[PDB]
Design a protein around this ligand. Structure first.
Ligand code: HDE
Ligand code: HDE
Ligand code: HDD
Ligand SMILES: [S]
Ligand SMILES: [S]
Ligand SMILES: [S]
Lengths: 726, 308, 726, 83
C-alpha cells in the first residue's frame, strides 16, 4: 500500500507550471516561502511522515481496517472506542457555511506601501515603505453554497485580512464599486430575493429567476449594481483579472486629527479580463472549480496574484460637492472626477495547507479597523458593522473565533474577556475586570496619539431627530446606470443586452419582465429597446418619450468603467491548448514552447487519448488531457502544430475544440497542414484577424499569436459567430 | 398593491404541465392533496396574506425600508431592535449540511401494501392492504455539498420515512444494491478519499481525482460499486427513473418469532433511464438543479413518482 | 497606579498557610513547580503586566469606561465595535455544565509507580519507577449544579487524567466501591430520580426527597450504595481524606497476553475523615465552597493531597470463585478476600491558573485507556463507554474537544480525522484517508507488542443470544448492605440510622417511607427498627421475621469498610480556631502555636471584631476573622488561651462557638480562666475525655489536644450532646 | 443565540407571542414554523406584498420611534451630570 519506488507520488517543492505536478499543501510545495503570520501558525501545523496512527487521545491503533465484533461475522461491540471516536469526529465535520459568499478560495501573501502616508493617515501599516504586513485573502461568489460553481454570473467578494502591528484590519470588498441596496435593513430582503427560492430551493448560483427580478423591478436603487452584474464584470476570467473595491466611503485620520474621506480600490496587475456568458455557463459544468484551481495553480507556478491598493481621497469640505451623496453605496465616484492615488502592492504567494482550517474558518469583518481609519454614516456600512461579529457565534461556534489559528492577530492582544466555548487562552491575570488594584490595573488603556495609541472615534458632528427615513439625496437611481452603460465599448454593451435578455427570459411571470424593461427605459432607450426586442416586448409611446437621466457632474462617460476600452493585457500566467497529432513536427513545437516560455504563458498538450505520443524527431510527448477532458473553455488560445494532421483531421472532438474556441472569441493559430481546419470554422484563404496561420510556427507566427493574446479576445469576430453551430 | 390586476402572479391550484405556471409551495399548489402526516403539520404552517408584518415578538413594523438613525444621513442607533432582530435571524440562517448526501430533493406521498404480509412480518404498516402510511422521501447525491449540481456521476441516495402507527420506520437506501466498503470503521477513509481533497477542496461532485482512485486501487473490495458508478447507473435521467435498494440484509420477524432475511428493493414504475456522460456533465452547467426541478414539476403536473 | 505603595496587593510567591495571603493562580503562586503537562500548556498561557488593553483583534482601546454616543447624553451608536465585541464575549461566556458531577474542584500533580508492574501489565506509565506521569484530577459531587454547595450528602467523584507517553488514561472513580444500579440503560432513570424534581426543580444537592426514595424502594439493587451515602462516607471532611475507587472490574494485560482482573483503589495518605450531618448541612450555608477552598489552600500551603494507587487483583480462572458476580457493580470485593496491592503514589501540587479554562473544560472518560488495560462486560461500565464521548459534543462544542489545552495528550497524536467546529490543528498530510500511496500510507498502524504497540482488545470469548436480560447472578441485593452495616462502629451505625431517618422524614408521601423501611428489614432488623422508631412506623410480625441475608464468602464483617474502626489519623493540614481576648496571656499562645507548627497544624486567631489586639506583654496579635465570620464548622478543634476572659465571657458568639464545636464532637482545650467556659457546655469539675484543661497551655496540654486531633472526633461524647441547645 | 441555540428562540413555547406574528425571516436552527408565503422578501408582487407594513396609529399600528432630537459629537464620554 505504498508509494511508487520512483518517488512520483510526491510533487517537487519548486514552482512548476499548471498540470506538471500534483497540487499540494502550501507548506509542502513552497517550504521556504514565509511571513510573520505563516510562521505563527507553526504551533498548530501537524505533519504525518514517520508517525504512528493514533486516536485523538494519543493511543496507537493496531487495526484501522475493522470494527471490534463478537466473532469475525458477529455484532459490533459498544466498547469499540476507536471506531466510535473516528465515526464521531466524521459525523460532526461540517459547520454552517457563510450566509453569503459561502463559495470562496483563499491564499496567503504580503502587502507593503510604496511610500509613507503619514500626511493623511496614522495607520501603522501604511506608515513605512519597508514595513511588510502579512495578509490572507479570500475571493468569493455571493449567492451560491460552498459547493456551488465558480464561473457563475454573480458579484465577487474580495476580502483581505491585514495582520498589522496595531491590530487586524479587514478590508472586505467586492469586484464592483457599489452595492444593490442603500440601507442594511433591506439586506435580508435583497439576499432572500437573489438566493434560491424558499419553496423548492432553486436556482443555485443564479439571479436568473422571478424573485430576484421582482425585487429589482420594485427597487430601482438596485439598477446600478444590476448593470454591473449583467455586464461581463459578472463573469471574470480569474480572481487575478478583476478589480476590487471597498464599497463605502470610510475615513483616514492623520496624527493631527484631520479626517479625509476615502474609497478603496484594488487594481489587478495581471489586467482586467472576463469570460463570455456561453463559455462561463458551460464551464460551470465542465469545471465548477475553475477559479479555485486557477488561483491555486497560479501560485504554485510563481504567477503570484498581484494587486495595487489605491485610494480615492475627498477632503471633508468637499462632502457635498457632487451631484450624488458620498454616503450612498449605490453611487460610484468616477475616476474622471476623483483619481485613484496609488498606495501599495499586495502579492499572494502561498496557498494554505488545509482548506477547512484556514479558508472555511477564516472570519473577515469590515468593523475590524485600526487607529488611522474610521467609519462614516453610510447606512449600508453602518448595518454591516452589526452583522459580521454576530454571524460568527453560530458559524464558528462562539465568541472565541479570534483564537482559531487563521484569525489570530500577530499583534499582542490582552484584555479582561474570559471563558466562552472552546476557550484556548489560559489567562493568568489575577484580575478579570478594570479598574483593578490587584494587578495594578494591567492590561491598561492607552491614550490616542500619533503611533501605538488607543482607538478613538473621529468626533463627527451629529444633528437630527431619531428617524427611520431614507435621505432625500439617495433618491436618484438612473444616472449612474446610464454613466456605466455609456462608458462600455459597443461589444460590452451587446453583452449587457444579452445578459438582461437571457436572465429575463427565465423569469416565468411575464409582467416582471415588462416592469424591468420599463426600468431600463429610464436609463437608456437603446438598451431598453434591444432587451425588449429579445423578449418580444414593444415599448409604449410614453416609454419611448422618457427623458434620459442627467449626466453625472458633466460626464458623458468614463472609460475606467469599461473592462476593455483602455488596453491593459498581461499574458503571463495565461494558458494555451496545443492540439497534438501522432507525429508532431518537433521544429514547430520547439518554436511554440520557446516563445510561450519567454512570455510566461503555459501550455497543455492535448490528444484523443492519454499516455504518450512520439514526435518526428523521437521526442516522447506526455499528454496532459484528452480533447474532451480539457475543453477550450479552460484555455486562452489554441495552437495546432503541423505533422500528421490526418490523424486528427476527422476527429469530432478536435474539430469541435476549434469551433468552441472560435465562438468564444479566442485566438487560434494553425501551422502547416493544420491550416486544413480553417474549413471547420469557415475562414477564407485570405485569412482573418484573430486566426494566425503560416507554413510553420516561427518568430513571426508566435509574435502575432501573443499580440492577440495580449488583447484577450478577438471582439471583431463577434458578427461571424451567430452562424457557427457550436 | 404590487400584484398585477390580472392575477397572473399566482399559479392555478390545479395540475399544470412543466413551465406552464410558476412553481409554488405544495399546500398552495395542491391544497386538497392530504394525508395524515401533511394534516398533522397544520399546527405549524404559517400563512401570510392579509397579515401585518411584525417582529418575531409580534410587534407591527411601520417602516421595513430603513434603519433608525440620528438624522436621515446620520449614524444607525443601537436601540434599533427591529433592525437587529431581522439581521440577527438572517445572520444565523444556516445549519451544518449533511456530512454526505448534502445535496437532496424531497417530497411527501403515501404507501400501501398489495396484501397482508403477516405470515412473514408483524410490521403494522405491512399488515393490511387498506392501511395507508404517509411517507416523506428524499433523493440525493453523495459527495457534493448542498449547493452542488444534480446530474454529476455519483451514487444516489433514496431515503423513505414511513410514518407508521407503531413508530417511524426509515428505509435509508441507495440506487445500487451494494456499497464500496465492507466495514463501517473505513467509512471516513472512503468518504474522505471521494470528497474534495483537503489542501484545496477540489473537486466538487466528482470521484474523478487522485485520492478516490488511489483508495480504490488499494482496496479491491470497492470495485463492485465502482463498476456501478462508472456505468450509466451513475447518471440517472431522473429520480423517477432509477432503482432503489436497501443495501443490507435485514430481518423480518413474524408473530410466531420466525426470522426471514430480507433485502429491500424499489422498482421505478416510470422505468429505468439514464443520461450519457457528455450530456450529464454539460447539464451540471446549463441547469445544476435539473433533477430537483424535474421532481418538483412532475409532482405539480400529476406525473406522480411511483415505486414498487 | 491603583496598587498600594507597599505592594500588599500581590500574594507571596512561596508556600503560605491558609488565610496568610490572598489566593492566586497556580503559575503565579508557585512558578517553580512544573511537570511535563504544565510545561506544554505554556504556549496558551496569557500574561498581563505591562501590556496594553486591546480588542480580541489586537486594537488598543483608549477609553474602556464609556460607550460611543452622539453627544455625552446621547444614544449609543451601532458603530461602537469595541462595546459590542466586549459585550458579545460576555453574552456567550457560559457553556453547558456536566449532566452529573457539575460541581467539582481540580488540581495538577504527578504520579510515579513504586516498581515496574511489567509482569502483570504492559501499560507504559506503570513500567518503570523513574517514569513520572503528569496528572490533572477533578473531585466532585454528583447531583448539584456547578454553583451548588460542597459539603452536601452525596457520592463524590474522583477523576484522574494521566498524561502517559502512550496516550491519555482517565481513571474516572468515585469515593465508594460500588454504584446504585447494575445496567447503564437505567442511568437516566436513577439520575432523574435523585436530581431536582422536574415540576419545580427542588431540591438542590440532596437525595432527601420523594422521587429518590421512590426509585430506591422499587429497585433494591440500589441499597448497597444507599448504605454508603447514608453513612458518614457521604459527608467527607476534605477531598484529601476520602477513599477513591474505580467502580468496576477492568483488566490488566501483560506483554504475554495474559489478562488479570483488576479493581482500582486510591488510599488517602492524610487518612479517612468525615463531618457529622448537622455540621455538614450548616457548612453548606456558612461556606458552600469549603471543599474547593480547602483543596486550593492545602496546595498553596504545601499540604499537597497525596494518594496511593492500589489494585485488587483476581486471576482470570477465579472469575466465579465468589458469592457475587465480579461484573456486578453493586457488589464490592472485600479486602479481607482480595487485598489491595500498593502500586504507586500521586501528589497534587499545583492549582490551575484559570478555573473555567482548565477545570470546567476538562473532559474525563473511562473509555480512555491505553495498551496494557482493557474493559470487561460489566454492564454499567459497558454503557459508560458510550456516554463520555457523546456528552462532549454539546458540553464542549464538538468533536475537537481533545484540542482544548487541558485535554491535550502530551503523547503524539496523528490520524486522518479532519475538520469539525473549533478545529485547531492544521494538517499538512496530502492524505486524509488510508490506505494511501500519496503519503506512503503515514501515519501508519502499529502492531501490538510489549511496548509502544498498537491497541488490540483481549480476545474474550463471547457466547449467548442477543438478549435484554439481567444476569441471574446479579439478583442478590441485601448481603453487601448487611456486610457494610456490620462492619461499621456503633457510632457509625448511629449516623447511618440518623441519615436514613432524616432523609425519609423529608419524603412527603408516607407509603414511600414505609416501603424503604421494609427494604431495611431485609438487611438488618436492628437498623430497620431504629429507623422505623424515628419515623413512627411499627414493624409488622412478618417484617420482624425476615431471615437476614447470607454472609459474603464466610465474612461477617470487614473492618476496611469502616471509616474509623482502624485509626489512620494525620493532623498535618488540619486547623484550630484560637479564641482571643483583649489581653491574652502571651506565654499560653507562644506554647500553643509552637506545638501546632511542629505538627503542621494551622491556626486562625478569632475575635469579636477585625484589626488587632495586644497580649499581656505588649505582643500585637492580628485577627484573622470574627467568631461569626469563621464559625467552628470550619475548624477541626478549638483552643481558648487564658487572660482577660471577662472580655468574651458574655459574648454570645464566643459561647456559641464552643457549643457548636462541642455538639460536633470536636476537641476543645481551655487554659487558666478559659476554664470558666466549661459552664457553657456543661462540663463537670473533674473534667471529661475530649476537653483538655490546665492552669496554662503547656507541659502536656498541647500533646493531649494533638492526640485528640489525631483521633479526629470525640465519639464518646455522643450520649452528652442531645442535652445541649446548639 | 448560545443560551437557547439560535435565532428561533421565540418559537420555544413559553416564549411565543399570543399576538399574531408574520414576517419574511426564514430558517435558523430548529425552525418550527413552516412558511407558505411564496415570497420571503419585500417589496414583493408575487404575494401582493403580504405581510405588509402598518403605519403608526392610535391602535393596532406599526412601531415608530419618538423623534427625539439628537445633537452632539461622536464621543466616548460620561455626561458631567452623572458625576
Ligand atoms: C445502503 C445505503 C447507504 C449506505 C450503505 C450508507 N449510507 Fe449513509 N449516511 C451516514 C453515515 C453512513 C455510514 C456511517 C455508512 C456506512 C458505515 C453509510 N452512511 C453508508 C450519515 C453521515 O450518518 C448520514 C449523513 C446525514 C445523516 O443524517 O446521516 C448519512 C446519510 C445517508 C442518506 C441521506 C438521508 C437523507 O437525509 O436524505 C442516505 C440515502 C444514505 N446515507 C444511504 C446509505
Ligand atoms: C465508578 C465511577 C463512576 C460510575 C460507575 C459512573 N460515573 Fe459518570 N458520568 C457520565 C455518565 C455515566 C454513566 C452513563 C454511568 C453508568 C451508566 C456513570 N456515569 C456512572 C457522563 C454523563 O458521561 C459524565 C458527565 C460529564 C462527563 O463528561 O461524563 C459523567 C461524569 C462523571 C465524573 C466527572 C468527571 C469530571 O469531569 O470530574 C466522574 C468522576 C464520574 N462520572 C464517575 C462515575
Ligand atoms: C448587513 C448585512 C450585510 C451587508 C449589507 C453587506 N454584508 Fe458582506 N457579509 C455579511 C453581511 C453584510 C455577512 C452576513 O455578515 C457575511 C457572511 C457571513 C460572514 O461572516 O459575513 C458577509 C460576507 C461578505 C464577504 C465574504 C468575506 C469572506 O471571504 O469570508 C464579502 C467579500 C462581503 N460580505 C462583501 C460585501 C460588500 C462589498 C458589501 C457592500 C458594501 C457587503 N458585503 C454588504
Ligand atoms: S458596496
Ligand atoms: S449497502
Ligand atoms: S462503580
Amino acid at each position: 500500500s505504498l508509494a511508487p519506488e520512483d518517488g512520483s507520488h510526491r510533487p517537487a517543492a519548486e514552482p512548476t507550471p499548471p498540470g506538471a505536478q500534483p497540487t499540494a499543501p502550501g507548506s509542502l510545495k513552497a517550504p521556504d516561502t514565509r511571513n510573520e503570520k505563516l510562521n505563527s501558525l507553526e504551533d498548530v501545523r501537524k505533519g504525518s511522515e514517520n508517525y504512528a496512527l493514533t486516536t485523538n487521545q494519543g493511543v496507537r491503533i493496531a487495526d484501522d481496517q475493522n470494527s471490534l465484533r463478537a466473532g469475525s461475522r458477529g455484532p459490533t461491540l459498544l466498547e469499540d472506542f476507536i471506531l466510535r471516536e473516528k465515526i464521531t469526529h466524521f459525523d460532526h465535520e461540517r459547520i454552517p457555511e457563510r450566509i453569503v459568499h459561502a463559495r470562496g478560495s483563499a491564499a496567503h501573501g504580503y502587502f507593503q506601501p510604496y511610500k509613507s502616508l503619514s500626511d493623511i493617515t496614522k495607520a501603522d501599516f501604511l506608515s513605512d515603505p519597508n514595513k511588510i504586513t502579512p495578509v490572507f485573502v479570500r475571493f468569493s461568489t455571493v449567492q451560491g453554497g460552498a459547493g456551488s460553481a465558480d464561473t457563475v454570473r454573480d458579484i465577487r467578494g474580495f476580502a483581505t485580512k491585514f495582520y498589522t502591528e496595531e491590530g487586524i484590519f479587514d478590508l472586505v470588498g467586492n469586484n464592483t464599486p457599489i452595492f444593490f441596496i442603500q440601507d442594511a435593513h433591506k439586506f435580508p430582503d435583497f439576499v432572500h430575493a437573489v438566493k434560491p427560492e424558499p419553496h423548492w430551493a432553486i436556482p443555485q448560483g443564479q439571479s436568473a429567476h422571478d424573485t430576484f427580478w421582482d425585487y429589482v423591478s420594485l427597487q430601482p436603487e438596485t439598477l446600478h449594481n444590476v448593470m454591473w452584474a449583467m455586464s461581463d464584470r459578472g463573469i471574470p476570467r480569474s480572481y487575478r483579472t478583476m478589480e476590487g473595491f471597498g464599497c463605502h466611503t470610510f475615513r483616514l485620520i492623520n496624527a493631527e486629527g484631520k479626517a479625509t474621506f476615502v474609497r478603496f480600490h484594488w487594481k489587478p496587475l495581471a489586467g482586467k479580463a472576463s469570460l463570455v456568458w456561453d463559455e462561463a455557463q458551460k464551464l460551470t459544468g465542465r469545471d465548477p472549480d475553475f477559479h479555485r484551481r486557477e488561483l491555486w495553480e497560479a501560485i504554485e507556478a510563481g504567477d503570484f496574484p498581484e494587486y495595487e491598493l489605491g485610494f480615492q481621497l475627498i477632503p471633508e469640505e468637499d462632502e457635498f460637492k457632487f451631484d450624488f451623496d458620498l454616503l450612498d453605496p449605490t453611487k460610484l465616484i468616477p475616476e474622471e472626477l476623483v483619481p485613484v492615488q496609488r498606495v501599495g502592492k499586495m502579492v499572494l504567494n502561498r496557498n494554505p495547507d488545509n482548506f477547512f482550517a484556514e479558508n472555511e474558518q477564516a472570519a473577515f469583518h469590515p468593523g475590524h479597523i485600526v487607529p488611522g481609519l474610521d467609519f462614516t454614516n453610510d447606512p449600508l456600512l453602518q448595518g454591516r458593522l452589526f452583522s459580521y461579529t454576530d454571524t460568527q457565534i453560530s458559524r464558528l461556534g462562539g465568541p472565541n473565533f479570534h483564537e482559531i489559528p487563521i484569525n489570530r492577530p500577530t499583534a499582542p492582544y490582552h484584555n479582561f474577556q474570559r471563558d466562552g466555548m472552546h476557550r484556548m487562552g489560559i489567562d493568568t491575570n489575577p484580575a478579570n475586570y478594570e479598574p483593578n488594584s490587584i494587578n495594578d490595573n494591567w492590561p491598561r488603556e492607552t491614550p490616542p496619539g500619533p503611533k501605538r495609541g488607543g482607538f478613538e472615534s473621529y468626533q463627527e458632528r451629529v444633528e437630527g431627530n431619531k428617524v427611520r427615513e431614507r435621505s432625500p439625496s439617495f433618491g436618484e437611481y438612473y444616472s449612474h446606470p446610464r454613466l456605466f452603460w455609456l462608458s462600455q465599448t459597443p461589444f460590452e454593451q451587446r453583452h449587457i443586452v444579452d445578459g438582461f435578455s437571457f436572465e429575463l427570459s427565465k423569469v416565468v411571470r411575464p409582467y416582471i419582465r415588462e416592469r424591468v424593461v420599463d426600468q431600463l427605459a429610464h436609463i437608456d432607450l437603446t438598451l431598453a429597446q434591444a432587451v425588449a426586442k429579445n423578449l418580444g416586448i414593444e415599448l409604449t409611446d410614453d416609454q419611448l418619450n422618457i427623458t434620459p437621466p442627467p449626466d453625472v457632474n458633466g460626464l458623458k462617460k468614463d472609460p475606467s468603467l469599461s473592462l476593455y476600452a483602455i488596453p491593459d493585457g498581461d499574458v503571463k500566467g495565461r494558458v494555451v491548448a496545443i492540439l497534438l497529432n501522432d507525429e508532431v513536427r518537433s521544429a514547430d513545437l520547439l518554436a511554440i514552447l520557446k516563445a510561450l516560455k519567454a512570455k510566461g504563458v503555459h501550455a497543455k498538450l492535448l490528444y484523443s487519448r492519454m499516455g504518450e505520443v512520439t514526435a518526428d524527431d523521437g521526442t516522447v510527448l506526455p499528454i496532459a488531457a484528452t480533447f474532451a477532458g480539457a475543453p477550450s473553455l479552460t484555455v486562452d488560445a489554441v495552437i495546432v502544430p503541423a505533422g500528421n494532421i490526418a490523424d486528427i483531421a476527422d476527429n469530432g472532438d478536435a474539430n469541435y475544440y476549434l469551433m468552441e474556441a472560435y465562438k468564444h472569441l479566442k485566438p487560434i493559430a494553425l501551422a502547416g497542414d493544420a491550416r486544413k481546419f480553417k474549413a471547420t470554422i469557415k475562414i477564407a484563404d485570405q485569412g482573418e484577424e484573430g486566426i494566425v496561420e503560416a507554413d510553420s510556427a516561427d518568430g513571426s507566427f508566435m509574435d502575432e499569436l501573443l499580440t492577440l493574446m495580449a488583447a484577450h479576445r478577438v471582439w471583431s469576430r463577434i458578427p461571424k459567430i451567430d452562424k457557427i453551430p457550436a
